[PDB]
């Protein structure tokens, strides 16, 4: 797999910001958002995978994602926990 960071579309970045109450945009936001998103998502994946390897599994479950988020101060409700 390559370049799926471009799968995070410009309108999708619009809609996320619109939910956040954002009214008007500079085109620099799209590339900066993708970098910030990649860093947050990578940090969660790395913890989730680490739980998965500890349990000696091949498959990441929601509980692994839940614990990976939770420790960063991000308690997630609705996927088990």
């Amino acid at each position: 797999l390559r370049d799926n960071i471009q799968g995070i579309t410009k309108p999708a970045i619009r809609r996320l910001a619109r939910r956040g109450g954002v009214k008007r945009i500079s085109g620099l936001i799209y590339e900066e958002t993708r970098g910030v998103l990649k860093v947050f998502l990578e940090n969660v994946i790395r913890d989730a995978v680490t739980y998965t390897e500890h349990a000696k599994r091949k498959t990441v479950t929601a509980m692994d994602v839940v614990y990976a988020l939770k420790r960063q101060g991000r308690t997630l409700y609705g996927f088990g926990g």
């Binding site: 308690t75 997630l76 409700y77 609705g78 996927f79 088990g80 926990g81």
Partner: protein, 94 residues
């Protein structure tokens, strides 16, 4: 079959005592379970640290009553403290 404990039952009895003509979606239910587990881990964890700090073996109503005041805002703490006091007061009286 293998069994997993969840609070869906008691969550769907508490609602019937508050809004008898309403129900809960499976996802809202799942949220109320993670909320219970979270608050439970927080209070149990703080009651554990209180016993540890005081170099003492037993968790009691006191360690929980102190953890509650620490974790909840003051308005919620007083009401939760009231209910916790009444439950233990009745349980020991009955």
């Amino acid at each position: 079959r293998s069994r997993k404990e969840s609070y869906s039952i008691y969550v769907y009895k508490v609602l019937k005592q508050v809004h008898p003509d309403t129900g809960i979606s499976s996802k809202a239910m799942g949220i109320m379970n993670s909320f219970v587990n979270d608050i439970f881990e927080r209070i149990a964890g703080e009651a554990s640290r209180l016993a540890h700090y005081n170099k003492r073996s037993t968790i009691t109503s006191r360690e929980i009553q102190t953890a509650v005041r620490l974790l909840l805002p003051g308005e919620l703490a007083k009401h939760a403290v009231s209910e916790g006091t009444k439950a233990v007061t009745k349980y020991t009286s009955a």
